[PDB]
């Protein structure tokens, strides 16, 4: 019947799309797991505190950067000021 | 020639200008209409901000073209 | 008893700017003086600004225009930027 | 201990059989990239047995010309009856082994089979991405007031057109200056290098960003990160500089620029001028655009803002005399889309100007959709209606603070559908629903479906 | 005979299939069903600690079929049916 053929058409469309999507998902995850045997998911923190490696925000100004210009090491959160004083040659 | 400017609210205003008119002059006209200083104005055309000292013709700006006006949102 | 001093924060900053570089006790002492002094100069002139503008409260706006009075152009400007920057940083976080 | 299909290993034990296979896969994929829809329906989605179209997935046989359906087990029947255990899914080109009952997705050679001829060399010179770098995820520390920059950069860092450009070595291959302390694109390629690969051979992965900052200082110190600035202005400035670098690397009547920006981001608005009496006309002006700026007052939804944007306006300060109705008139102006970009960038105008000369931030939440339909905004009808035109949200920049002072943050979506928040040095996992609850300032949309 | 069905389908192909497929895709995409199915897939992959396509599909397909909104279902069916009353005799 018309009703039946229409149901079959819709089923055809849905099963085609589903099989495509699922095949793509399974192939991608298979690839990721095979390439990277020790694979870990990026961390999700419900508390909104930890990064994708499950770490908190690092202490600045505890970190420093070595400015290749002039040969001076400069605390990173003060780097721009240095460049304003350094690039002004 | 007449050109247009689409303001923050979406309202469009009209200016009478020449191709050789400077961005400063246009901004002055905008100041004269809206009461906003030129230093607060950002004038956009074709994906570029229009720069003082240049002319409309430098940017191939023609009659009844529309410029888009915005402000600045500073974040550091 | 406790004699307070800015020797540690200043050291810190020295390390920020010259990590392989040390400061003598006396240099430090001097610095600490400069700090107390500028503290008074600022605080005082701010107090004056408050008083002068019939206002019961000192906000960083006061400290700003203060900076614009004490300091010459570029110094003032930079100091201002640095400040409202660290203010923003405190606000957001 | 995940296994690999032993049947393809078996075939691959013989070099010429392997070559036949890879040749056929390559040929098939070329066909898939070069066949019109109807031919595809009739010749790759038609079951060889029942002759139905789309009887579930249809599979094209690796060893013969037969196509077979899933629903009636007809490929399954080809496999049982002829002994051909490998078939290709006509929706994705992926190769199925009917003995394992699983797809082969984890063989690098198969995924990149077009390089099979040079595969040995490919394996000697290069390695797969490191786990840490594979998604290019790393934070960029605040080096002063750089939030307006990095927030912009992460959406660029996750843009497929840009990543395709950069990883293709186009600037590197063609740069006449070939120095990242002068060339913005070389520096960018270095960034990509630092984030996805490894420099030869803790402070990690900051070199490219520092080069970019140095270039920026050299062209405009004010926009170089010391002071707070506007992210949209930085966007237009940097894309213009990139465009300028494209023009620079050229060896050579062409009004439209042919650069990467103008083949991705450039569209055109149609502005019509029509007589309110005759309502026929019209005087049409075409304006290029690289992004759209929207008013938000008294609105709650992005579609409302676009509707307002697209809404007709009557000019009251334009001198206009109609020749068709022979009278002085107040003209009607309307903006619509003449041409859409591949990637659509939106700025919400989250500010207003007061009579006392001060400005105020608009913190109003504006709802924005995960998928955006542009059909109501296209100027030109076909022999009419305009078809569905849908974009996918891929990027968000948000601001916290006031008009004159604040902070930018970025949100980016990656594969599998997961969202991450990029806050300077901190990259974190975030749900879609919360991103969708954010106060959006900038939005990045990639073209997804065009009917 | 049942060659008739295949014949009719061939006609359907030569003529509109794109409009249906595209409208379906747009509807399922816009209402969030596609991403729900992605999340379901990641969840099932994580629960069964497996990327084997057959076993994952065996659990995914029925539920995914149930998840199709009634609105989209009846609208797309309605549309196909609209297209069918054109080219069959009763
Ligand atoms: Zn330096
Ligand atoms: Zn069949
Ligand atoms: Zn065969
Ligand atoms: Zn097998
Ligand atoms: Zn270069
Ligand atoms: Zn171009
Ligand atoms: Zn008229």
Swiss-Prot record, chain A:
GO BP term, pick one: chromatin organization
Pfam families per record: Sgf11 (PF08209), Sgf11_N (PF18519)
Compartment annotation: Nucleus
Taxonomic superkingdom: Eukaryota
Alphabetical list of InterPro entries matching this protein: SAGA_su_Sgf11, Sgf11_N
Domain note: The long N-terminal helix forms part of the 'assembly lobe' of the SAGA deubiquitination module.
Function as written in the Swiss-Prot or TrEMBL entry: Functions as a component of the transcription regulatory histone acetylation (HAT) complex SAGA. At the promoters, SAGA is required for recruitment of the basal transcription machinery. It influences RNA polymerase II transcriptional activity through different activities such as TBP interaction and promoter selectivity, interaction with transcription activators, and chromatin modification through histone acetylation and deubiquitination. SAGA acetylates nucleosomal histone H3 to some extent (to form H3K9ac, H3K14ac, H3K18ac and H3K23ac).
Name the UniProt record assigns to this protein: SAGA-associated factor 11
Lineage, highest ranks first: Eukaryota, Fungi, Dikarya, Ascomycota, Saccharomycotina
From Swiss-Prot, chain B:
Protein location: Cytoplasm; Nucleus; Mitochondrion outer membrane
Domain Ubiquitin-like positions: 1-76
Residues flagged as site, Interacts with activating enzyme: 54, 72
Cited function: Exists either covalently attached to another protein, or free (unanchored). When covalently bound, it is conjugated to target proteins via an isopeptide bond either as a monomer (monoubiquitin), a polymer linked via different Lys residues of the ubiquitin (polyubiquitin chains) or a linear polymer linked via the initiator Met of the ubiquitin (linear polyubiquitin chains).
Sites of Phosphoserine modification: 65
Post-translational modification: Phosphorylated at Ser-65 by PINK1 during mitophagy. Phosphorylated ubiquitin specifically binds and activates parkin (PRKN), triggering mitophagy. Phosphorylation does not affect E1-mediated E2 charging of ubiquitin but affects discharging of E2 enzymes to form polyubiquitin chains. It also affects deubiquitination by deubiquitinase enzymes such as USP30. Mono-ADP-ribosylated at the C-terminus by PARP9, a component of the PPAR9-DTX3L complex. ADP-ribosylation requires processing by E1 and E2 enzymes and prevents ubiquitin conjugation to substrates such as histones.
Consequence of substituting residue 63 to R: Abolishes HLTF-mediated polyubiquitination of PCNA
Site (Essential for function): 68
Effect of residue 65 to D: Phosphomimetic mutant that binds and activates PRKN
Cross-link (Glycyl lysine isopeptide (Gly-Lys) (interchain with K-? in acceptor proteins)): 76
Natural source organism: Homo sapiens (Human)
Membrane topology: Peripheral membrane protein
Effect of residue 76 to A: Loss of ADP-ribosylation
Cross-link Glycyl lysine isopeptide (Lys-Gly) (interchain with G-Cter in ubiquitin) mapped to chain: 6, 11, 27, 29, 33, 48, 63
ADP-ribosylglycine modified-residue sites: 76
Protein name, entry field: Ubiquitin
PTM annotation ((Microbial infection) ADP-ribosylthreonine): residues: 66
From Swiss-Prot, chain C:
Post-translational modification, as annotated: Monoubiquitination of Lys-89 by BRE1 gives a specific tag for epigenetic transcriptional activation and is also prerequisite for histone H3 'Lys-4' and 'Lys-79' methylation. GlcNAcylation at Ser-81 promotes monoubiquitination of Lys-89. It fluctuates in response to extracellular glucose, and associates with transcribed genes.
Keywords, ordered alphabetically: Acetylation, Chromosome, DNA-binding, Glycoprotein, Isopeptide bond, Nucleosome core, Nucleus, Phosphoprotein, Ubl conjugation
Key word Cytoplasm present: no
Top-level division of the source organism's lineage: Eukaryota
GO cellular component term, pick one: nucleosome
Cell compartments where the protein resides: Nucleus; Chromosome
Function recorded in the entry: Core component of nucleosome. Nucleosomes wrap and compact DNA into chromatin, limiting DNA accessibility to the cellular machineries which require DNA as a template. Histones thereby play a central role in transcription regulation, DNA repair, DNA replication and chromosomal stability. DNA accessibility is regulated via a complex set of post-translational modifications of histones, also called histone code, and nucleosome remodeling.
Family: Belongs to the histone H2B family.
Protein name per the record: Histone H2B 1.1
Source organism of the structure: Xenopus laevis
UniProtKB/Swiss-Prot annotation, chain D:
Subcellular location: Nucleus
Binding locations of Zn(2+) 3: 61, 64, 78, 84
PROSITE patterns according to UniProt: USP_1, USP_2, USP_3, ZF_UBP
Boundaries of every USP domain copy: 138-448
Gene3D superfamilies (UniProt xref): Cysteine proteinases, Zinc/RING finger domain, C3HC4 (zinc finger)
EC supergroup of this enzyme: hydrolase
Active site: 147, 407
Pfam families, per database record: UCH (PF00443), zf-UBP (PF02148)
Zn finger region (UBP-type): 23-123
UniProt-annotated binding residues for Zn(2+) 2: 47, 50, 69, 74
Function: Histone deubiquitinating enzyme component of the transcription coactivator SAGA complex. SAGA acts as a general cofactor required for essentially all RNA polymerase II transcription. At the promoters, SAGA is required for transcription pre-initiation complex (PIC) recruitment.
Domain remark in the UniProt entry: The UBP-type zinc finger domain is required for the interaction with the SAGA complex.
Family statement drawn from the similarity comment of this UniProt entry: Belongs to the peptidase C19 family. UBP8 subfamily.
Protein name in the entry: Ubiquitin carboxyl-terminal hydrolase 8
Organism: Saccharomyces cerevisiae (strain ATCC 204508 / S288c)
